[PDB]
Structure formats: structure tokens, C-alpha cells
């Protein structure tokens, strides 16, 4: 129902940094591929609200475990590759519209808990250097990642 008229689901993505300027990299459940946390915005909620909701759901971090350092000024879209589009589910989703948030983890690493939900999207995590995700992200997200990390870079450097 939240799919817009172009087929894009509104969505929030999360870049969690530590004080050393590393960023949190999460492993997709039962897979060997990795990504930043992201999640669909629900009917009712703002971007910020969706962000906190998916943050606890996917990473186990509460509002007091983090502080918002920045968000992207605009929405950044990515299109699914055609072979991943589920054409029989109406309304058809062809990609995500995304509002990205830069968070600083202010609590200890032990606060990250990837099992607060019964259906976790991730099964592990590590800190990686700031630009490593631009290479390692799945191809169809790389355009968005490159633009997000470029936009966030000046904030993270300044710590």
C-alpha cells in the first residue's frame, strides 16, 4: 500500500559509525552477503520513526544507544534488477526510495543485538573502514551508496 505511483517503496537506510570513523556492516541472514540496515516506512510513520523502528528491529539499538549526526537532504532511489521484481504482487515494487541516516553509536558494542525479532534480517556484523561498503555493496545499490557515503563523509571525518 505504501508503494508510490512509480513502483518505489519509501524506505530508510542506516549508516552507523563509531568514534574511530568505522561503519557498521551487517551480514544478511543465512547468506554471505553484507549491507547496511534499511527498512520500509510504514503507513503512519515519518522517516525518523521508521528509522528508529527498523534500527531496533535489525540492530537491537535503542534511541539512547545512538545519536543522529545527519540525514540525506533528498530521497535516493534504486531500481531492482528486472530478475528480482515480483511482477505478480500488486502493487508491483520495482525499487526503493530511500532516506538515509547517519548515526553515531554512543553505547558500547555489546548493545548491538541482531536477534530482537523472531525473523532477523541479519546474523552478524563487523566494523569496516568508511569507504569499504562502496566497493562491497551489491551492484544495484552502489549508486546510492556512493552518493550517501560521499554526502556523509565530511561529518564522519570531523570526529
Amino acid at each position: 500500500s505504501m508503494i508510490d505511483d512509480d513502483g518505489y517503496r519509501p524506505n530508510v537506510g542506516i549508516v552507523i559509525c563509531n568514534r574511530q570513523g568505522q561503519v557498521m556492516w551487517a551480514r544478511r541472514f543465512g547468506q554471505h552477503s553484507w549491507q547496511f540496515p534499511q527498512g520500509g516506512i510504514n503507513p503512519g510513520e515519518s522517516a525518523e520513526q521508521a528509522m528508529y523502528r527498523e534500527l531496533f528491529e535489525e540492530v537491537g539499538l535503542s534511541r539512547k544507544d545512538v545519536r543522529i549526526l545527519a540525514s540525506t537532504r533528498n530521497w535516493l532511489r534504486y531500481k531492482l534488477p528486472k530478475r528480482l521484481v515480483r511482477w505478480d504482487t500488486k502493487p508491483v515494487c520495482i525499487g526503493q526510495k530511500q532516506k538515509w541516516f547517519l548515526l553515531q553509536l554512543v553505547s558500547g558494542d555489546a548493545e548491538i543485538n541482531m536477534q530482537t525479532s523472531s525473523t532477523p534480517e541479519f546474523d552478524g556484523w563487523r566494523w569496516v573502514s568508511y569507504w569499504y561498503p562502496v566497493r562491497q555493496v551489491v551492484s544495484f545499490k552502489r549508486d546510492v551508496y556512493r552518493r550517501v557515503m560521499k554526502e556523509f563523509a565530511s561529518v564522519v571525518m570531523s570526529l
Binding site: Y130, V134, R135, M157
Partner: protein, 275 residues
């Protein structure tokens, strides 16, 4: 429009490209075009900064020549690279961990904006040079044509023979250079350094490189000259090296320590080119 910079380091003109925040694929065709001084940009070498392949490193970078081939020479472009990623706000680190075609380095950007490279520990074992001599001596005797020469011999990873000279502008680098470069006691040849000791902390140097002849800024040769001079009791712990192509600063505490080479990188220009 792809943004780039021109930079100058170790006597070389680099075109430098942020391929971290820019999406650019450097095919041999595109490289050859960019190397064209009229259709493209023009450069001695092209330095491309990329996201790291390893999550514990900050960047990867590659160097390409005008033919469009990747070049793998140890330490090549390191000063321009370190200064570029700081000038462009890709990092704020002073110790930058980077992978290259030749492996990884930790580069340090000093307070006067110079870039310091750990060159490893110099090795004086003749077998490791390779050099034909029975044991490591601080000074060796060699006959070059109708001449006898005193020299030091060290490996910085590559082979070096250093000769003290009382004025580098006068020395016969064009005659003695070739004779010692392919001298019988260097089975794999050697870089021949002509060192003028101005002060325990200041030398002038010219280098007849293995196979390449006299170049303007051989970094490993500056390291080797200072390493031999220190081993021979002639030089201080920190030496300014004046080469035809500019100045380096070598630091070495002697055996058991690595040798450090510090050098500048000049930001010459910025530009853009529509691909």
C-alpha cells in the same frame, strides 16, 4: 564531467582521480585517451584512488601508464596519493592504510604536509643484494675499467652500489655508471649512486639506475645512499637528500630498525573532463 587533479611527486607528473565518490571505469582505451595531451589530459602516470578491498584498509589505488597498462612498482605515487585523499576530504587520517599492486603500506602525513613511507630494513648481506663478495663489509674495493673504486653495497629490496663523490655535478655518471651497473659482481645488475656528502645530515645525489640510466628522483637510491653512509659512520640519523628532481628526507636508526623516506607532493591543478 569527471573531476581530476594534477600532482607532482618523485619527479613525476600524476593525473589523480577520486574513483571513490565518482563512478568511473578505466579501460585501456579510456586511459590511452586521457593520456593524449590534446584529446585528453596528458600525464606521466595516472593514479586512481578506489575504495579498499580489505575492511581494515582505507583505500586501494592503482597506477596506469600512458599505454593503458597497470603499473606495479613498490611505493609508486604514495605521496601524491596520501596528500590527495586528505586534500579532497576522503579521509582526515594522518596514518593512511592503503593497498596497491605491490601490497599494502601505512603512509604518514607529517605536520608540514610531507608524506613518510616505511621502506623496510636495509639489508647488507651480499647474498641478498645479490653481490659477489665473501662477507658483508662496510666498504668494498672494485676495479671498473682502468679504475679502482671504493663503494658500499646494500639491498632496499633492489640492489644498490654507492660511491662517494666530491661534487655530483662533476662526477662521470655517464662513464662509471654503466661500468658498475652491469659489473660482473652484480649478477642482477645494480643501481649506482654518486653521493656528495655536504654535511652529516645533508647529501647530494645522482643515480644511474639499473637499466634505466640517470633518472631525476630514484627514491630507493636515496634510501640506499643514506643507509650506506650511515653504515659507514659518515651520516647522521636523519639526512636531507638532494636529487636532480627534488628533495627527500631519510631517517634510519641503523640495523634492527626500518628506514623511513619522507617526501613532498605538489598539488598542481584541478580539472574536469567530459568522458
Amino acid at each position: 564531467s569527471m573531476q581530476f587533479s594534477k600532482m607532482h611527486g618523485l619527479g613525476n607528473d600524476f593525473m589523480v582521480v577520486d574513483a571513490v565518490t565518482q563512478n568511473v571505469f578505466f579501460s585501456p582505451e579510456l586511459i590511452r585517451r586521457l593520456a593524449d595531451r590534446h584529446l585528453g589530459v596528458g600525464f606521466d602516470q595516472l593514479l586512481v584512488v578506489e575504495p579498499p578491498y580489505d575492511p581494515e584498509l582505507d583505500f586501494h589505488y592503482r597506477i596506469f601508464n600512458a599505454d593503458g597498462s597497470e603499473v606495479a612498482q613498490c611505493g609508486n605515487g604514495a605521496r601524491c596519493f596520501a596528500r590527495f585523499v586528505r586534500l579532497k576530504g576522503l579521509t582526515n587520517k594522518r596514518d593512511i592504510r592503503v593497498s596497491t599492486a605491490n601490497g599494502r603500506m601505512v603512509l604518514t602525513v607529517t605536520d608540514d604536509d610531507l608524506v613518510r613511507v616505511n621502506m623496510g630494513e636495509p639489508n647488507f648481506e651480499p647474498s641478498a643484494v645479490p653481490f659477489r663478495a665473501n662477507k658483508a663489509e662496510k666498504t668494498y674495493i672494485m676495479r671498473a675499467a682502468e679504475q679502482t673504486i671504493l663503494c658500499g653495497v646494500v639491498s632496499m629490496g633492489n640492489p644498490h652500489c654507492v660511491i662517494q663523490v666530491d661534487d655530483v655535478d662533476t662526477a662521470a655518471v655517464e662513464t662509471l655508471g654503466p661500468v658498475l651497473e652491469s659489473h660482473e659482481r652484480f649478477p642482477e645488475r645494480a643501481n649506482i649512486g654518486f653521493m656528495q656528502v655536504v654535511k652529516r645530515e645533508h647529501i647530494r645525489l645522482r643515480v644511474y639506475e639499473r637499466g634505466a640510466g640517470e633518472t631525476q628522483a630514484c627514491g630507493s637510491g636515496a634510501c640506499a645512499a643514506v643507509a650506506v653512509g650511515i653504515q659507514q659512520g659518515l651520516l647522521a640519523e636523519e639526512v636531507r637528500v638532494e636529487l636532480p628532481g627534488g628533495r627527500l628526507d631519510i631517517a634510519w636508526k641503523g640495523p634492527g630498525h626500518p628506514l623511513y623516506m619522507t617526501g613532498p607532493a605538489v598539488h598542481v591543478y584541478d580539472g574536469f573532463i567530459h568522458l
